[PDB]
Amino acid sequence: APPIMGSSVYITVELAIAVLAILGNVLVCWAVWLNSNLQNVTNYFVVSLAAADILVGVLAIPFAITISTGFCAACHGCLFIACFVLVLAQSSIFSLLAIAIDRYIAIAIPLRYNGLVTGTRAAGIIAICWVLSFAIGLTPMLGWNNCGQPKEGKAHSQGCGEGQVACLFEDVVPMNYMVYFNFFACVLVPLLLMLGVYLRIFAAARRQLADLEDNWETLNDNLKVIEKADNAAQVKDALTKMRAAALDAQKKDFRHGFDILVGQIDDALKLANEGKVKEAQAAAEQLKTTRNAYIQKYLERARSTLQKEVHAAKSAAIIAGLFALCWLPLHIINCFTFFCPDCSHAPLWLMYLAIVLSHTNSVVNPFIYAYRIREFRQTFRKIIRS
Ligand SMILES: CC(C)CCC[C@@H](C)[C@H]1CC[C@H]2[C@@H]3CC=C4C[C@@H](O)CC[C@]4(C)[C@H]3CC[C@]12C
Numbered sequence: 113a114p115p116i117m118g119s120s121v122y123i124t125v126e127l128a129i130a131v132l133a134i135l136g137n138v139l140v141c142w143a144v145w146l147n148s149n150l151q152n153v154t155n156y157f158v159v160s161l162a163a164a165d166i167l168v169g170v171l172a173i174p175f176a177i178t179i180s181t182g183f184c185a186a187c188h189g190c191l192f193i194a195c196f197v198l199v200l201a202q203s204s205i206f207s208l209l210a211i212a213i214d215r216y217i218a219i220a221i222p223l224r225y226n227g228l229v230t231g232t233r234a235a236g237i238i239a240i241c242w243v244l245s246f247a248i249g250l251t252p253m254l255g256w257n258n259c260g261q262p263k264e265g266k267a268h269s270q271g272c273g274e275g276q277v278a279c280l281f282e283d284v285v286p287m288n289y290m291v292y293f294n295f296f297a298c299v300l301v302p303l304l305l306m307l308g309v310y311l312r313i314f315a316a317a318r319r320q321l322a323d324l325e326d327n328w329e330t331l332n333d334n335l336k337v338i339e340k341a342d343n344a345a346q347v348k349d350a351l352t353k354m355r356a357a358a359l360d361a362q363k364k365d366f367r368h369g370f371d372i373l374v375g376q377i378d379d380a381l382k383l384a385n386e387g388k389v390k391e392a393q394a395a396a397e398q399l400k401t402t403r404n405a406y407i408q409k410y411l412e413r414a415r416s417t418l419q420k421e422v423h424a425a426k427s428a429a430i431i432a433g434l435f436a437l438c439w440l441p442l443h444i445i446n447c448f449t450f451f452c453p454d455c456s457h458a459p460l461w462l463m464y465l466a467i468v469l470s471h472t473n474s475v476v477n478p479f480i481y482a483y484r485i486r487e488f489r490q491t492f493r494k495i496i497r498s
Pocket residue numbers: 184185186188189190192193
């Protein structure tokens with residue numbers, strides 16, 4: 113069948129994806145610019161990622177349409193339009209890795225997050241990552257390319273001029289670059305590191321939630337021990353364990369609560385050490401008002417904050433996983449092309465499906481934000497309504 117027919121379908125689909133990638137990610141960037149509740153370091157990387165996806169629509173997809181035609185071009189110009197999308201993917205990888213690391217710092221050392229992770233340092237990291245993304249993605253332009261070995265029979269059949277090639281991705285970009293350097297080193301390894309970071313995030317959250325419930329149970333158990341103690345020494349033992357746990361949980365109304373709690377434990381220990389069991393047990397009962405009025409409120413808020421961090425880390429992990437799902441088919445096909453020269457090449461229709469799927473990744477993030485992050489969803493609604 114005439115190539116222009118299957119080309120027409122591929123090109124129309126690419127153009128539809130480009131429209132949606134631009135619209136959704138412009139909306140992401142507008143939301144962050146407009147809403148101060150969205151202006152945090154994590155979202156500066158979200159914006160960097162949306163900018164990469166805007167440029168997939170504006171540049172990488174027009175470039176992909178162009179290179180599907182095999183038009184006559186100087187080999188190094190052809191290289192640039194072949195490789196620019198690799199810059200954007202690499203930038204996306206760096207942004208996704210930064211987001212994972214940011215959430216890990218927030219869950220593992222929240223007390224030093226704000227002093228360690230600042231907007232100016234984030235903006236510098238983003239600049240560096242964009243520079244490194246150009247260096248990685250345009251590495252074929254530094255000489256790791258097939259321009260030294262042009263397919264002259266294909267160029268002559270297409271009437272190309274002297275020094276020109278039929279501009280085709282696999283004719284100019286070496287597959288050993290695409291497989292070993294781009295895929296294994298620059299994509300797979302960072303995705304695997306991301307997986308490791310998310311595992312550490314969820315394990316740290318699970319451990320901290322378990323510790324909250326353990327400290328609550330230890331407090332209530334030790335209250336029972338005091339209630340059913342039969343000498344002053346048993347009361348002393350349980351209170352000493354209560355006091356060390358209270359200080360461990362201490363590091364306004366909350367600090368007031370902990371101040372009362374530790375003070376009331378000290379009151380009871382003083383009576384216990386004087387051998388006044390009944391007086392110490394009555395003093396320790398006072399702890400129950402402090403537990404009800406203050407400590408339980410601190411516990412629920414800490415649990416709620418941890419649960420919100422788990423939810424936000426799950427949202428970020430979904431984004432990273434969808435990047436992997438959308439890009440892996442094309443990379444896997446490249447592995448078959450490279451490692452199995454006895455295998456027939458994947459058919460053209462499948463090449464174009466895998467390319468289109470990789471571009472679809474630039475559409476999906478605005479939807480994940482809308483469905484999973486209330487502050488985004490509400491700002492989107494306000495932008496759209498107005
Ligand atoms: C600021 C942004 C929008 C600038 C976009 C510039 C783009 C479209 C330019 C920059 C470099 C250009 C390429 C440089 C060299 C060649 C080789 C020539 O034989 C055919 C065209 C081709 C392949 C050009 C295509 C257009 C091109 C990719």
